[PDB]
Amino acid sequence: ALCAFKDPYNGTILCSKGSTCYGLWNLVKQGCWSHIGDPQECHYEECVVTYRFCCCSTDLCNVNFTE
16 A cells, blocks of 8 residues: 655655554654554555544545544
8 A cells, every 4th residue: 555654753655565654743753654464454455543642544544534
C-alpha cells in the first residue's frame, strides 16, 4: 500500500504488499505497519482510534483518523 509518511527525526511511502499503514497523533508519526496474524488489529479504509493511534489497510487511509 501507499501510506502517508511522517517522521520528525512528498509525504508518502510505498510499503510492502503485506503491510498496512499507521498514524499516531498534533500529528506525531505515520508510515508502514508490519504486524501480521491479527485481522482485527487494523481497520480497512478508515483509520479508527478505539495518544491517538490507528492502523488501516488501504492507500492513504492514515491521512486522518476517526474516534
